[PDB]
Amino acid sequence: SKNVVIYADGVYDMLHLGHMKQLEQAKKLFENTTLIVGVTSDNETKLFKGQVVQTLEERTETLKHIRWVDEIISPCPWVVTPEFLEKYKIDYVAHDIYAWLKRAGKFKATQRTEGVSTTDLIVRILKNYEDY
């Protein structure tokens, strides 16, 4: 069957197994896909979500090494709009309000895997060190 275009977006700061599992599950929504990934800009993330460690350039250069990623939009828009889907010919949006997306049948949800973040790893490192 013919090729389906998928779009996911996020910050992808300090990329870990949780991000990649999501990207993987987006990519495999259908047997034949193109996964476009959008990366949020520095100023906008800092304004609405909060603190970002790596720059756009870093966060993007890392995402390029994930096999599931076919295309990166960098920076992506912070609000996805119907015009934006029309331009890049996007069939579905993988996320986890964004209500117009469902009404149009273009919403596919994916899951987060907790406990595999990069911060969690640092926590484990620290627990080599008894408090007393």
Add this chain to the structure above:
Amino acid sequence: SKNVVIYADGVYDMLHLGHMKQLEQAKKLFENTTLIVGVTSDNETKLFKGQVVQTLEERTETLKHIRWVDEIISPCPWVVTPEFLEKYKIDYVAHDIYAWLKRAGKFKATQRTEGVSTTDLIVRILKNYEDY
């Protein structure tokens, strides 16, 4: 031209842009390659190199998401030997003594990128916090 088999190995703890740049450069040594990656076992790393954060299973599950990786040997042997190259039909070994490898024309060196590690990121996080 025909397909060349490449083998790189390491610990791949807390995988970052430095690891992936090396893997990328291994993969692109020739126009047509298969990159096999070997991941060192927990007990052996702890015995000879030192402290490992993530287990083999974690370190391997992460490496699977890198597009340049065609095959993973997990766990790999800690000493690569001529027999091991014969078994998996390995043409070159990407590393950075291992002297027999050069004498046989099977040594190709790759470079590390400093300053992009996962520990370095945590250092940057901490520098939001003045000492006084």
